[PDB]
Homo-oligomer: A and B are copies of this chain.
Amino acid sequence: SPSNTDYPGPHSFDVSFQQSSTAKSATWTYSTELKKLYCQIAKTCPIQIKVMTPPPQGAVIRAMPVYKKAEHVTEVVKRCPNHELSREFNEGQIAPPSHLIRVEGNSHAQYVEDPITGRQSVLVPYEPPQVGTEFTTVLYNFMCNSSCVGGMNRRPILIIVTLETRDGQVLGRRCFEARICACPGRDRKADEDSI
């Protein structure tokens, strides 16, 4: 299984989320001390990338899902069959109906599965912020609820975004739990009460 350990690296690589509009019906929200994303299915979710020094030639940013619990870590993460086949979300998407993770607003994006692992992930060429901007925004879409039967089956997962060299070297990586549900607002308020 792939590594899920925070490694800032040579470019002080960092992933973060802008203000999570706590306005009750927020399409997504992020608990900072739970290191957890609560996101509605398919809704666009913006991620902030910061680097302390410019990364290499054609570096890239990959996002890969994986289960949190040890008993499952071995199993790939993809869209439950019902969602892989249904008409919605698939209309005419340049992504494979299997991949739980999609990127938005970036035609240079490229999806991929590994023959040896059969692990699914999406890659995007790194691109420095625009003038007077501190972050580089990547737009993500999560295609299955974390409770789809025949898929995540209510099994927690976590996103492992990593920065890499044009040819695979791991320049840095960060991770956060991701619960893609219907009421990120409620499911977060509640999780913050279990303690």
By a beta-carbon cutoff of 8 Å, the part of chain A in contact with chain B is 80-86, 148-150
A-B contact pairs, 17 of them (CB 8 A): A80-B82, A81-B81, A81-B82, A81-B84, A81-B85, A81-B86, A81-B150, A82-B82, A82-B148, A82-B149, A82-B150, A83-B149, A83-B150, A85-B150, A86-B150, A148-B149, A149-B149
Stoichiometry, as copies per complex, reads 4
Closest to A149 in B: B82
A85–B149 Cα gap in the complex (Å)?
11
Query: Using Cβ atoms and an 8 Å threshold, which residues of chain B touch A149?
Result: 82-83, 148-149
Query: Using Cβ atoms and an 8 Å threshold, which residues of chain B touch A83?
Result: 149-150
Query: Using Cβ atoms and an 8 Å threshold, which residues of chain B touch A84?
Result: 81
Closest to A84 in B: B81
Closest to A82 in B: B150
* Interchain nearest-CB distance for A149 vs B (Å): 5
Query: Using Cβ atoms and an 8 Å threshold, which residues of chain B touch A81?
Result: 81-82, 84-86, 150
